[PDB]
């Protein structure tokens, strides 16, 4: 079962390599909203460089402003690692930009998409399927 003191599952994945598919348990996708208003936020992460985040994207559009933090959170992560994005909060954010109780709905969209990319990180190697008929 594993002659070698290694268990990794592979060094990347079992499809001959691939990288960048939204499928993959290499990348992390986190797409969350504000119901309350009308707004859409798309965060995704990506890790490869050792369980390091070397790319970060994302995609907010309906709300016209709440990109600029989107730029902020995305160029906070890039280089970090899952260990740190699992752990920052909105009120970082929130004090780094100086903003009102009137629009606390970004940071909210900011610190709640990085627990959805993870959460969709992490579930991307749980219960996994077990039934598929081709």
Request: aromatic share 4%.
């Amino acid at each position: 079962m594993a002659y070698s003191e290694k268990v990794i599952d592979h060094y990347e994945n079992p499809r001959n390599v691939g990288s960048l598919d939204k499928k993959d348990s290499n990348v992390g996708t986190g797409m969350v909203g504000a119901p309350a208003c009308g707004d859409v936020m798309q965060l995704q992460i990506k890790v490869d460089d050792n369980g390091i985040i070397e790319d970060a994207k994302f995609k907010t559009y309906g709300c016209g402003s709440a990109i600029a933090s989107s730029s902020l959170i995305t160029e906070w992560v890039k280089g970090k690692s899952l260990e740190e994005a699992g752990a920052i909060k909105n009120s970082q954010i929130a004090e780094e930009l100086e903003l009102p109780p009137v629009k606390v709905h970004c940071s909210i969209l900011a610190e709640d998409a990085i627990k959805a990319a993870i959460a969709d990180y992490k579930a991307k190697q749980g219960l996994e399927h077990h039934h598929h008929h081709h």
